[PDB]
Amino acid sequence: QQYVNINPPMPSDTPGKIEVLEFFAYTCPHCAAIEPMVEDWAKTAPQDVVLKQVPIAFNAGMKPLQQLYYTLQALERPDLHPKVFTAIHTERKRLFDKKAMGEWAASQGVDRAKFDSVFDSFSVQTQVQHASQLAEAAHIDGTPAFAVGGRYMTSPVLAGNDYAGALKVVDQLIVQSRK
Protein backbone atom coordinates (compact mmCIF):
# COMPACT_ATOMS: atom_id res chain seq x y z
CA GLN A 1 0.00 0.00 0.00
CA GLN A 2 2.34 2.75 1.26
CA TYR A 3 5.52 1.28 -0.25
CA VAL A 4 6.66 -0.64 -3.31
CA ASN A 5 8.95 -3.63 -3.63
CA ILE A 6 12.36 -3.29 -5.27
CA ASN A 7 12.83 -6.22 -7.66
CA PRO A 8 15.48 -7.55 -7.97
CA PRO A 9 16.56 -6.63 -4.44
CA MET A 10 19.67 -4.54 -4.06
CA PRO A 11 22.68 -6.25 -2.44
CA SER A 12 23.68 -5.00 0.98
CA ASP A 13 26.68 -2.68 1.21
CA THR A 14 26.83 -2.71 5.04
CA PRO A 15 27.21 -6.19 6.57
CA GLY A 16 25.06 -6.73 9.64
CA LYS A 17 23.10 -3.52 9.10
CA ILE A 18 19.85 -2.52 7.45
CA GLU A 19 20.51 0.36 5.04
CA VAL A 20 18.07 3.24 4.64
CA LEU A 21 18.87 5.32 1.56
CA GLU A 22 17.33 8.78 1.38
CA PHE A 23 17.46 9.84 -2.24
CA PHE A 24 17.48 13.64 -2.35
CA ALA A 25 18.51 16.68 -4.33
CA TYR A 26 19.68 20.00 -2.93
CA THR A 27 17.34 21.80 -5.36
CA CYS A 28 14.26 19.90 -4.13
CA PRO A 29 12.11 22.05 -1.80
CA HIS A 30 10.62 19.01 -0.08
CA CYS A 31 14.08 17.52 0.50
CA ALA A 32 14.97 20.80 2.21
CA ALA A 33 11.78 20.71 4.27
CA ILE A 34 12.25 17.12 5.43
CA GLU A 35 16.00 17.38 6.11
CA PRO A 36 15.74 18.39 9.81
CA MET A 37 13.13 15.68 10.39
CA VAL A 38 15.43 13.08 8.82
CA GLU A 39 18.35 14.31 10.92
CA ASP A 40 16.20 14.04 14.05
CA TRP A 41 14.94 10.57 13.06
CA ALA A 42 18.53 9.40 12.57
CA LYS A 43 19.35 10.34 16.18
CA THR A 44 16.95 7.66 17.53
CA ALA A 45 17.15 5.05 14.75
CA PRO A 46 18.01 1.43 15.68
CA GLN A 47 21.69 0.76 16.13
CA ASP A 48 21.62 -1.95 13.42
CA VAL A 49 20.33 0.63 10.88
CA VAL A 50 22.52 2.99 8.85
CA LEU A 51 21.20 6.05 7.03
CA LYS A 52 22.85 7.09 3.79
CA GLN A 53 21.81 10.26 1.99
CA VAL A 54 22.23 9.77 -1.76
CA PRO A 55 22.07 12.79 -4.12
CA ILE A 56 20.45 12.07 -7.47
CA ALA A 57 20.40 13.61 -10.94
CA PHE A 58 17.27 13.50 -13.10
CA ASN A 59 18.97 15.75 -15.65
CA ALA A 60 22.64 16.44 -16.34
CA GLY A 61 22.48 19.88 -14.73
CA MET A 62 21.90 18.19 -11.37
CA LYS A 63 25.26 16.37 -11.48
CA PRO A 64 27.29 19.26 -9.96
CA LEU A 65 24.97 19.13 -6.95
CA GLN A 66 25.80 15.44 -6.53
CA GLN A 67 29.47 16.41 -6.66
CA LEU A 68 28.81 19.12 -4.07
CA TYR A 69 27.40 16.59 -1.59
CA TYR A 70 30.35 14.21 -1.82
CA THR A 71 32.86 17.08 -1.85
CA LEU A 72 31.55 18.43 1.45
CA GLN A 73 31.64 14.93 2.95
CA ALA A 74 35.20 14.31 1.72
CA LEU A 75 36.35 17.66 3.17
CA GLU A 76 34.90 16.52 6.52
CA ARG A 77 32.44 19.44 6.53
CA PRO A 78 29.14 17.61 7.15
CA ASP A 79 28.02 20.72 9.03
CA LEU A 80 27.76 22.41 5.62
CA HIS A 81 25.34 19.79 4.22
CA PRO A 82 22.13 21.13 5.86
CA LYS A 83 23.35 24.66 5.17
CA VAL A 84 23.29 24.01 1.40
CA PHE A 85 19.51 23.51 1.61
CA THR A 86 19.12 26.70 3.65
CA ALA A 87 21.33 28.68 1.27
CA ILE A 88 19.40 27.58 -1.81
CA HIS A 89 15.83 27.67 -0.52
CA THR A 90 15.76 30.28 2.25
CA GLU A 91 18.60 32.63 1.26
CA ARG A 92 17.89 32.14 -2.49
CA LYS A 93 21.57 31.72 -3.36
CA ARG A 94 22.22 30.25 -6.82
CA LEU A 95 24.57 27.41 -5.86
CA PHE A 96 24.14 25.55 -9.13
CA ASP A 97 27.63 25.39 -10.67
CA LYS A 98 31.14 24.66 -9.43
CA LYS A 99 32.18 28.32 -9.42
CA ALA A 100 29.29 29.51 -7.24
CA MET A 101 29.67 26.44 -5.01
CA GLY A 102 33.38 27.06 -4.43
CA GLU A 103 32.81 30.73 -3.63
CA TRP A 104 30.10 29.76 -1.15
CA ALA A 105 32.27 27.08 0.46
CA ALA A 106 35.18 29.53 0.73
CA SER A 107 32.89 31.93 2.58
CA GLN A 108 32.25 29.01 4.98
CA GLY A 109 35.96 28.50 5.70
CA VAL A 110 36.77 25.88 3.05
CA ASP A 111 40.04 26.36 1.19
CA ARG A 112 39.07 27.09 -2.40
CA ALA A 113 41.94 25.10 -3.92
CA LYS A 114 41.06 22.00 -1.88
CA PHE A 115 37.37 22.37 -2.72
CA ASP A 116 38.13 22.59 -6.44
CA SER A 117 40.57 19.67 -6.28
CA VAL A 118 38.22 17.37 -4.34
CA PHE A 119 35.24 18.36 -6.51
CA ASP A 120 37.10 17.13 -9.62
CA SER A 121 38.64 14.05 -7.97
CA PHE A 122 38.28 10.47 -9.18
CA SER A 123 36.97 9.56 -5.73
CA VAL A 124 34.08 12.03 -5.96
CA GLN A 125 33.39 11.00 -9.56
CA THR A 126 33.12 7.38 -8.45
CA GLN A 127 30.79 8.23 -5.57
CA VAL A 128 28.54 10.22 -7.92
CA GLN A 129 28.42 7.33 -10.39
CA HIS A 130 27.55 4.96 -7.55
CA ALA A 131 24.83 7.31 -6.31
CA SER A 132 23.20 7.25 -9.74
CA GLN A 133 23.62 3.46 -9.93
CA LEU A 134 21.82 3.07 -6.60
CA ALA A 135 18.99 5.32 -7.74
CA GLU A 136 18.62 3.31 -10.95
CA ALA A 137 18.58 0.00 -9.07
CA ALA A 138 16.02 1.33 -6.58
CA HIS A 139 13.81 2.49 -9.51
CA ILE A 140 13.74 6.08 -8.26
CA ASP A 141 10.87 8.20 -9.57
CA GLY A 142 11.10 11.33 -7.40
CA THR A 143 12.67 12.94 -4.35
CA PRO A 144 12.70 12.64 -1.39
CA ALA A 145 12.45 8.87 -1.43
CA PHE A 146 13.57 6.16 1.01
CA ALA A 147 14.86 2.70 0.09
CA VAL A 148 14.94 0.27 3.03
CA GLY A 149 16.97 -2.94 3.19
CA GLY A 150 17.50 -2.85 -0.57
CA ARG A 151 14.00 -4.30 -0.88
CA TYR A 152 11.35 -1.61 -0.22
CA MET A 153 10.79 1.97 -1.34
CA THR A 154 8.59 4.61 0.28
CA SER A 155 8.15 8.39 0.11
CA PRO A 156 6.04 11.14 1.68
CA VAL A 157 3.64 10.85 -1.28
CA LEU A 158 3.23 7.09 -0.89
CA ALA A 159 2.78 7.45 2.89
CA GLY A 160 -0.33 9.62 2.66
CA ASN A 161 1.38 12.87 1.59
CA ASP A 162 3.14 13.27 4.91
CA TYR A 163 6.79 13.56 5.98
CA ALA A 164 6.33 11.93 9.38
CA GLY A 165 4.20 9.25 7.73
CA ALA A 166 7.08 8.36 5.41
CA LEU A 167 9.44 7.86 8.35
CA LYS A 168 6.81 5.75 10.15
CA VAL A 169 6.68 3.52 7.07
CA VAL A 170 10.49 3.39 7.04
CA ASP A 171 10.30 2.15 10.63
CA GLN A 172 7.79 -0.53 9.58
CA LEU A 173 10.01 -1.54 6.66
CA ILE A 174 13.06 -1.83 8.94
CA VAL A 175 11.19 -4.38 11.05
CA GLN A 176 10.16 -6.23 7.87
CA SER A 177 13.75 -6.21 6.60
CA ARG A 178 14.87 -8.16 9.68
CA LYS A 179 12.16 -10.69 8.69
Question: 59, 177, 69: which is closest to 118 by C-alpha?
Answer: 69
User: What sign has the CA pseudo-torsion 142, 144, 148, 152?
Assistant: negative
106/26 Cα distance (integer angstroms): 19
179/164 Cα distance (integer angstroms): 23
89/146 Cα distance (integer angstroms): 22
> Can you give the resolution of this entry in Å?
1.6
Q: How many CB atoms lie within 10 A of CB 89?
A: 17
Say which CATH architecture domain 4-177 belongs to. 3-Layer(aba) Sandwich (3.40)
